[PDB]
Design a protein around this ligand. Structure first.
Ligand SMILES: CSc1ccc(C(=O)/C=C/c2cc(C)c(OC(C)(C)C(=O)O)c(C)c2)cc1
Lengths: 257, 9
């Protein structure tokens, strides 16, 4: 019953996200083209985003990041639509939950394609190194390093996709978002998902008896990561003309934090 | 939020 809510959420995760942790680990275990310097970035661009190539490399990369985000937002909207109870909410609350939750979910899921040396990109066909991203000019070199720091500690929890699907549902189904209309119903929806997450972790991770409170803390850490990311994005938009922001992403950030 | 609202429709 609750086991079935957990399975339905996991099934919806496997169906709606192009990348999952099993798929990513297969690729990361050895084929992705390695982007480790300007030469290989330019090569990967010609093979994997050929239409895109011509501002500075950093602005081209930032454009690619946005395309990745827009795609993941669409996947999250479908996944959410598949979360039992979500589609019965007021359409305006559905928008609010997704507006505040998508980047928390994005950076949680990004951990699955990250290791200490770099991350998968372009639908698993590239691997960009962490040191290359640090090498970009300011402010672009400041984007990803806090996400790697989050991911190394998140990955140390050794969650699998059955855990992560419930965690992403719990992020989305969050009753304390600003502007909610039916807070009471959302809190009950959230309580039900968190209940299923709590029991699932007890079953799937009997070795780690604090895993549930650890994940509650990661949820709070993600909120802060998102606030800080949104601040950097605002600095980039105001100080870099070549770095326009996609309209869906402007809509999400607008009046967020 | 017209894109989200349409994405959800
Ligand atoms: C082919 S090169 C390449 C491809 C993909 C990636 C990548 O994974 C992106 C991570 C990433 C990067 C950035 C700037 C990012 O913030 C943007 C897009 C403005 C936002 O939506 O707020 C997010 C949310 C995620 C890096 C390089």
């Amino acid at each position: 019953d609750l086991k079935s809510l957990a399975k339905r959420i996991y099934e919806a995760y496997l169906k709606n996200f192009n990348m999952n942790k099993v798929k990513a680990r297969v690729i990361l275990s050895g084929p992705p083209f390695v982007i480790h310097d300007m030469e290989t970035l330019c090569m990967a661009e010609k093979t994997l985003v050929a239409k895109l190539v011509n501002k500075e490399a950093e602005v081209r990369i930032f454009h690619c990041c946005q395309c990745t985000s827009v795609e993941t937002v669409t996947e999250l909207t479908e996944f959410a639509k598949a979360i039992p109870g979500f589609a019965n909410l007021d359409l305006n609350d559905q928008v609010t939950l997704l507006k505040y939750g998508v980047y928390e979910a994005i950076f949680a899921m990004l951990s699955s394609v990250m290791n200490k040396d770099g991350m998968l990109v372009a639908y698993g066909n590239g691997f960009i190194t962490r040191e290359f991203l640090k090498s970009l000019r300011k402010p672009f070199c400041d984007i990803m390093e806090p996400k790697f720091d989050f991911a190394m500690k998140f990955n140390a929890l050794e969650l699998d996709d059955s855990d992560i699907s419930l965690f992403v549902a719990a992020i989305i189904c969050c009753g304390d978002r600003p502007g909610l209309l039916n807070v009471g119903h959302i809190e009950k929806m959230q309580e039900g998902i968190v209940h299923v997450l709590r029991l699932h972790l007890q079953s799937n991770h009997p070795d780690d008896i604090f895993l549930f409170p650890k994940l509650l803390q990661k949820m709070a850490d993600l909120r802060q990561l998102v606030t800080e990311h949104a601040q950097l994005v605002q600095i980039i938009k105001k100080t870099e003309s070549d770095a326009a922001l996609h309209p869906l992403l402007q809509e999400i950030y607008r009046d967020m934090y | 939020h017209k894109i989200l609202h349409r994405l959800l429709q």
